[PDB]
From Swiss-Prot, chain A:
Component of the general transcription and DNA repair factor IIH (TFIIH) core complex, which is involved in general and transcription-coupled nucleotide excision repair (NER) of damaged DNA and, when complexed to CAK, in RNA transcription by RNA polymerase II. In NER, TFIIH acts by opening DNA around the lesion to allow the excision of the damaged oligonucleotide and its replacement by a new DNA fragment. In transcription, TFIIH has an essential role in transcription initiation. It comes from the Eukaryota. Transmembrane segments: none annotated. Component of the TFIID-containing RNA polymerase II pre-initiation complex that is composed of TBP and at least GTF2A1, GTF2A2, GTF2E1, GTF2E2, GTF2F1, GTF2H2, GTF2H3, GTF2H4, GTF2H5, GTF2B, TCEA1, ERCC2 and ERCC3. Component of the 7-subunit TFIIH core complex composed of XPB/ERCC3, XPD/ERCC2, GTF2H1, GTF2H2, GTF2H3, GTF2H4 and GTF2H5, which is active in NER. The core complex associates with the 3-subunit CDK-activating kinase (CAK) module composed of CCNH/cyclin H, CDK7 and MNAT1 to form the 10-subunit holoenzyme (holo-TFIIH) active in transcription. (Microbial infection) Interacts with varicella-zoster virus IE63 protein. This is General transcription factor IIH subunit 2. The chain holds residues 10 to 50 of 395 of the full protein. Coiled coil: none annotated. Belongs to the GTF2H2 family. It is found in: Nucleus.
From Swiss-Prot, chain B:
Signal peptide: none annotated. Belongs to the TFB1 family. It is found in: Nucleus. Component of the 7-subunit TFIIH core complex composed of XPB/ERCC3, XPD/ERCC2, GTF2H1, GTF2H2, GTF2H3, GTF2H4 and GTF2H5, which is active in NER. The core complex associates with the 3-subunit CDK-activating kinase (CAK) module composed of CCNH/cyclin H, CDK7 and MNAT1 to form the 10-subunit holoenzyme (holo-TFIIH) active in transcription. Interacts with PUF60. (Microbial infection) Interacts with Rift valley fever virus NSs (via OmegaXaV motif); the interaction leads to TFIIH complex proteasomal degradation. This is General transcription factor IIH subunit 1. (Microbial infection) Upon Rift valley fever virus infection, interacts with NSs leading to ubiquitination by the NSs-FBXO3 E3 ligase and proteasome-dependent degradation. Component of the general transcription and DNA repair factor IIH (TFIIH) core complex, which is involved in general and transcription-coupled nucleotide excision repair (NER) of damaged DNA and, when complexed to CAK, in RNA transcription by RNA polymerase II. In NER, TFIIH acts by opening DNA around the lesion to allow the excision of the damaged oligonucleotide and its replacement by a new DNA fragment. In transcription, TFIIH has an essential role in transcription initiation.
Curated annotation (Swiss-Prot), chain D:
Dephosphorylation reactivates the 5'-excision step. Phosphorylation has no effect on transcription or the 3'-5' helicase activity. It is linked to Xeroderma pigmentosum complementation group B: An autosomal recessive pigmentary skin disorder characterized by solar hypersensitivity of the skin, high predisposition for developing cancers on areas exposed to sunlight and, in some cases, neurological abnormalities. The skin develops marked freckling and other pigmentation abnormalities. Some XP-B patients present features of Cockayne syndrome, including cachectic dwarfism, pigmentary retinopathy, ataxia, decreased nerve conduction velocities. It is found in: Nucleus. Component of the 7-subunit TFIIH core complex composed of XPB/ERCC3, XPD/ERCC2, GTF2H1, GTF2H2, GTF2H3, GTF2H4 and GTF2H5, which is active in NER. The core complex associates with the 3-subunit CDK-activating kinase (CAK) module composed of CCNH/cyclin H, CDK7 and MNAT1 to form the 10-subunit holoenzyme (holo-TFIIH) active in transcription. Interacts with PUF60. Interacts with ATF7IP. Interacts with KAT2A; leading to KAT2A recruitment to promoters and acetylation of histones. Belongs to the helicase family. RAD25/XPB subfamily. This is General transcription and DNA repair factor IIH helicase/translocase subunit XPB.
From Swiss-Prot, chain F:
Its main location: nucleus. Component of the general transcription and DNA repair factor IIH (TFIIH) core complex, which is involved in general and transcription-coupled nucleotide excision repair (NER) of damaged DNA and, when complexed to CAK, in RNA transcription by RNA polymerase II. In NER, TFIIH acts by opening DNA around the lesion to allow the excision of the damaged oligonucleotide and its replacement by a new DNA fragment. In transcription, TFIIH has an essential role in transcription initiation. Stimulates the ATPase activity of TFIIH subunit XPB/ERCC3. It is found in: Nucleus. The gene is GTF2H4. It comes from Homo sapiens. It comes from the Eukaryota. InterPro entries: Tfb2_C (IPR040662), TFIIH_p52/Tfb2 (IPR004598). Transmembrane segments: none annotated. This is General transcription factor IIH subunit 4. Coiled coil: none annotated.
Length: 41, 100, 66, 65, 402, 453
């Protein structure tokens, strides 16, 4: 019963180019950099 | 003798241990079953925590070494030294009882 | 004076006898090897350089086989 | 089926088809077989696909039931 | 191979020194099929039977052995261990092979377990599918192609190529010895090279085989591993060639035409009750009763008919120094190839197979240290006496039948 | 090295070529444009600091001030600059002008040294070439294509002119420096062993040696006109002259201008006149000793698994005719899979030369692919296989000579060995069999010594 789920899993993992269109990995980088804490002791 | 337990015991290469023909090294005051060409030691013990040892007679074709510990753990050591085994299967037995 | 002009060829001691077998087999001239200095130095007739180029087809094949 | 793996090869080349010689060849051997079950012989069922059954009726069922 | 309940006939690749007959018994339990083991020789009978003892209860319930003179329960069980189809002689084996073929097609038709099919021709495969009506076939062979053939593929009758494992992950885990390949090219002796291009018979094969320049290197490789008391065995295709290699330096030797009772004790003198270290084997004492399983292998001849038999011998003999290697190397593997003897025709094809096994390959034409070593054949007088013996050896010296 | 060691370092080739020139030509060489080149090309600080010492001092100084300026822990580096002092050939040791062994520099070079550092005048801003006040007002990327075409034509002569039909005399020019070899059975020249390395680093340092190749004849060519003309492209871009060079020129200045334009360091307008503009490759000549560039992604990547070395493919029109010139590889059906059965193709090119260091340089340094992505050493175990193929051509030797046999004593043969060794006609000797090989070039001299002893 391994090939019954392994064949359908590769169909989703192969189409990984669709995730690059969304700005998920880019919008977080600009927001995580502006996090400047200020605790002057 | 210098009354110091000198002369390092005879070292025998390639010794089986439950389908694992590793390497049992006999140093000075402790035993060390070195896992093949490595730097660490899998079976690490000394010349103290070994109760009694067992060997094989002349009638048995196989030659296995058994070291009875203290908590009931018995580990067999099937010898496989292709060089000299008849003369060394007793040397391992003799050098572990004549030198303490 | 007594001189002997030839073509100096530097080779391997175990390979010197390879050219000697061709001397007793080739029937083109009188004798292939004219003078043998040592195990790493042999001579050959100067006018047989172009003829020796034909034997490269059978010499280079076994050369890569070493 | 071979028609599904062809679309993935065309996307890898990035605007370019793989020549076209091997495209028409993707129609030979299919996935067919036999299964032994309660019938005590053979039960003819293979995979959930559909091109593996269409090209077979013109050989075995035409000469014997 | 079987991960969806379907069939998918093919040949899988697995390490030789890890358990070739062990994956077949484990797969037979998940497939839930009354399989049939078909070995390649007599050594495959005791190997497959050992896995049905410490893993299942088939050894004392549904066991059967049609070969090696047993016939244990001919009716009442289908799981048996045979040897392909070598039990079908004309006239001499009439009613013996008839009862085996008829009673097999009725109570057995499961999986056709096959092992080592890269040396079996297509003529034997025709008799396998004829005597049995198996509905599936299994392929357990670690090699890629068969009999070194690239123009004719005869693997479509016993299952083609299915999947191969990552040899880089298999070697860097604890499944095969860290084989360090290094070719050693020795110069050709001038006294024996003159008679090689002189005759046109099969006697010239022993000339470059008995190379004194290679014998000094063969003895140096043994001495190089004698101080390291490692399991070393020199391989040779010829039978009467490895005999002189052991008498000159006082070492035991075994070959084909010997005795069954003599090899029974000598074979145990290397793995069970050892006493001799340097032993010389061939193509008979390896796949007949017990696997050699040494560590260092030396190849003398590289032009024999067994151009693919030594491929699987590299994995079965060269075993690790423990069984679960971490990440360092220790095992060595050299090869003695003559120079200017038309031997590179096979020494080149081995490079295509070693790069796929993840082994380190290199060429060392100069040992650098062979002359400064207490070896034999130091003077030129001893090398001349060997010529009067090699040419005087009759080529009829082979077995004793007519 | 077979003729490229003097190209990597510029300050060493200039000192070696200066030693073999005419005394009248060296006088005109000591000019103001040459002062900024004998120091900028150097590298050690000791050889460059002595230039400023001979400028302020008006009287010759003895060697006592030099042996004391090293204080006590610096005389070790003084011996390294001793050999360089005679390379430039500008100093002069007198007898005793004020002490003992007074060192002084040529006052002809000292006058022009202050013009290009402190003092000045008028003739420096009147002559062209060295100055030429003119700005640039032309499309720069449009002229960069002509710089590559000048170097591509040279590649056609190294192969055998596959599609070129120009009348440029560049085949015989490169044959003098040991780069191109004339074909014996044919007529189109090929390439030597040192010519393969030139097509690997791709540095403009070799073009500097091509400019001074015509001056090596020492007949009717001067160095003062070549040095003042080579300074044009050394100032990067924005260094022209509009039409000032047309009014002030001669027949000798036009000859060196046409040869420099065909090298790839300067571009000339139509009709070989009007305005000239240097190429882009001249910037790297004054920057360092080498350089890189020409790619932005590096699609090529070799294989470090097997041993046939799968070379890179699919790049541009430069690597197409470059690999075939090396050893003529093979190609299969797809995008020109080069180098797939390398076993006999490499041995065909090694029979005409010991080209062993150029193949390794092309295999390791081709576009920097593995040394940036991976980590271990690029060549696997082929470093020994390449040396084996070079030794295969050493199994034989095609040379002529005469042999002397049948002597009488043993002590008499040892005296004859020194006769052929001093003259340079001895090849191999044998004291055990009394045999000596003598080249036919000195056969008429060895026979005379034997008849007298």
């Amino acid at each position: 019963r391994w090939e019954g789920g392994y064949e359908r899993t590769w169909e989703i993992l192969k189409e990984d180019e669709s995730g690059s269109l969304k700005a998920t990995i880019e919008d977080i980088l600009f927001k995580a950099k502006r996090k400047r804490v200020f605790e002057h002791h | 003798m210098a009354t110091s337990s000198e002369e390092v015991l005879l070292i025998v290469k390639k010794v089986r241990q439950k389908k694992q023909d590793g390497a049992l090294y006999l140093m000075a005051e402790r035993i060390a079953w070195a896992p093949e060409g490595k730097d660490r030691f899998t079976i690490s013990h000394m010349y103290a925590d070994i109760k009694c040892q067992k060997i094989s007679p002349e009638g048995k074709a196989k030659i296995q070494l058994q070291l009875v510990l203290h908590a009931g753990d018995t580990t067999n050591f099937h010898f496989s030294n292709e060089s000299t085994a008849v003369k060394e299967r007793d040397a391992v037995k003799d050098l572990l009882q004549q030198l303490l | 004076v007594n001189v002997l002009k030839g073509v100096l060829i530097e080779c391997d001691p175990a390979m010197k006898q390879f050219l000697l077998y061709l001397d007793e087999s080739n029937a083109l001239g009188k004798k292939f090897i004219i003078q043998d200095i040592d195990d790493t130095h042999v001579f050959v007739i100067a006018e047989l350089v172009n003829v020796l180029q034909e034997r490269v087809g059978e010499l280079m094949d076994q050369n890569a086989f070493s | 089926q071979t028609s599904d793996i062809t679309e993935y090869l065309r996307k890898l080349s990035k605007t370019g088809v793989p020549d076209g010689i091997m495209q028409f060849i993707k129609l030979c051997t299919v996935s067919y077989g036999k299964v032994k079950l309660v019938l005590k012989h053979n039960r003819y069922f293979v995979e959930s696909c559909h091109p593996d059954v269409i090209q077979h009726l013109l050989q075995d069922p035409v000469i014997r039931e | 191979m079987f991960g969806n309940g379907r069939a998918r006939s093919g040949v899988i690749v697995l390490p030789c020194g890890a358990g070739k007959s062990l994956v077949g018994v484990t797969a037979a339990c998940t497939v839930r099929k009354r399989c049939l083991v078909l070995g390649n020789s007599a050594v495959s009978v005791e190997q497959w039977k050992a896995q049905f003892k410490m893993w299942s209860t088939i050894d004392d319930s549904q066991i059967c052995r049609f070969t090696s003179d047993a016939k244990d329960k001919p009716i009442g069980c289908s799981v048996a261990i045979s040897t392909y189809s070598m039990l079908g002689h004309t006239t001499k084996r009439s009613w013996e092979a008839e009862r085996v073929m008829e009673w097999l097609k009725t109570q057995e038709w499961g999986l056709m377990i096959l092992d080592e099919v890269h040396t079996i021709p297509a003529k034997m495969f025709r008799r396998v599918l004829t005597i049995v009506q198996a509905h599936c076939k299994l392929g357990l062979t670690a090699t890629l192609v068969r009999e070194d053939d690239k123009i004719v593929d005869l693997n479509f009758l016993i299952g083609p190529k299915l999947y191969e494992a990552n040899w880089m992950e298999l070697q860097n885990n604890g499944y095969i010895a860290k084989v360090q390949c290094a070719e050693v090219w020795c110069p050709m002796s001038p006294e024996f090279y003159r008679e090689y291009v002189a005759i046109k018979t099969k006697k010239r094969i022993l000339l470059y085989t008995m190379n004194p320049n290679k014998f000094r290197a063969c003895q140096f490789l043994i001495k190089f591993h004698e101080r390291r008391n490692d399991k070393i065995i020199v391989f040779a295709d010829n039978v009467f060639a490895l005999k002189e290699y052991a008498i000159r330096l006082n070492k035991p030797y075994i070959y084909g035409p010997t005795s069954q009772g003599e090899r029974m004790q000598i074979l145990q003198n290397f793995k069970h009750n050892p006493k001799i270290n340097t032993i010389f084997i061939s193509k008979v004492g390896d796949t007949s009763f017990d696997l050699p399983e040494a560590n260092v292998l030396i190849q003398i001849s590289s032009h024999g008919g067994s151009r693919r038999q030594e491929a699987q011998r590299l994995g079965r003999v060269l075993r690790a120094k423990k069984g679960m290697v971490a990440e360092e190397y220790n095992a060595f593997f050299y090869s003695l190839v003559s120079q200017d003897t038309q031997e590179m025709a096979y020494s080149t094809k081995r490079q295509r197979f070693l790069v796929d096994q993840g082994y380190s390959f290199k060429v060392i034409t100069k040992l650098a240290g062979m002359e400064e070593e207490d070896l034999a054949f130091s003077t030129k007088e001893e090398q001349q006496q060997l010529l009067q013996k090699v040419l005087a050896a009759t080529d009829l010296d082979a077995e004793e039948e007519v | 090295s077979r003729g490229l060691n003097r190209v990597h370092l510029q300050c060493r080739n200039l000192q070696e070529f200066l030693g073999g020139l005419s005394p009248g030509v060296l006088d005109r060489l000591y000019g103001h444009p040459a002062t900024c080149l004998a120091v900028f090309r150097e590298l050690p600080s000791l050889a460059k600091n002595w230039v400023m010492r001979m400028l302020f001092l008006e009287q010759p100084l003895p060697q006592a001030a030099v042996a004391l300026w090293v204080k006590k822990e610096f005389s070790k580096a003084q011996e390294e600059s001793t050999g360089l002092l005679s390379g430039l050939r500008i100093w002069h040791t007198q007898l005793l002008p004020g002490g003992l062994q007074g060192l002084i520099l040529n006052p002809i070079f000292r006058q022009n040294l202050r013009i290009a550092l402190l003092g000045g005048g008028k003739a420096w801003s009147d002559d062209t070439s060295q100055l030429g006040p003119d700005k640039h007002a032309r499309d720069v990327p449009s002229l960069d294509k002509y710089a590559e075409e000048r170097w591509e034509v040279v590649l056609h002569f190294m192969v055998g002119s596959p599609s070129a039909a120009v009348s440029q005399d560049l085949a015989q020019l490169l044959s003098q420096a040991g780069l191109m070899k004339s074909t014996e059975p044919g007529e189109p020249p090929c390439i030597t062993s040192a010519g393969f390395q030139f097509l690997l680093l791709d540095t403009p340092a070799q073009l500097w040696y091509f400019m001074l190749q015509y001056l090596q004849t020492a007949q009717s060519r001067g160095m003062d006109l070549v040095e003042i003309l080579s300074f044009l492209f050394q100032l990067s871009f924005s260094t022209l002259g509009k039409d000032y060079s047309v009014e002030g020129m001669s027949d000798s200045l036009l000859n060196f201008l046409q040869h420099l334009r065909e090298f790839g360091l300067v571009f000339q307008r139509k009709r070989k006149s009007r305005r000239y503009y240097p190429t882009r490759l001249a910037i790297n000549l004054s920057s360092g000793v080498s350089g890189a560039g020409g790619t932005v992604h590096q699609p090529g990547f070799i294989v470090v698994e097997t041993n046939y070395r799968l070379y890179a493919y699919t790049e541009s029109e430069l690597q197409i005719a470059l690999i075939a010139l090396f050893s003529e590889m093979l190609y299969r059906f797809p995008n020109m899979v080069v180098a797939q059965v390398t076993r006999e193709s490499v041995q065909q090119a090694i029979a005409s030369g010991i080209t062993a260091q150029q193949i390794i340089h092309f295999l390791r340094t081709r576009a920097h692919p593995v040394m940036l992505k991976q980590t271990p050493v690029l060549p696997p175990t082929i470093t020994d296989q390449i040396r084996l193929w070079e030794l295969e051509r050493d199994r034989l030797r095609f040379t002529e000579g005469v042999l002397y046999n049948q002597f009488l004593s043993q002590v008499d043969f040892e005296l004859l060995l020194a006769h052929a060794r001093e003259l340079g006609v001895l090849v191999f000797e044998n004291s055990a069999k009394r045999l000596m090989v003598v080249t036919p070039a000195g056969h008429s001299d060895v026979k005379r010594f034997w008849k007298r002893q």
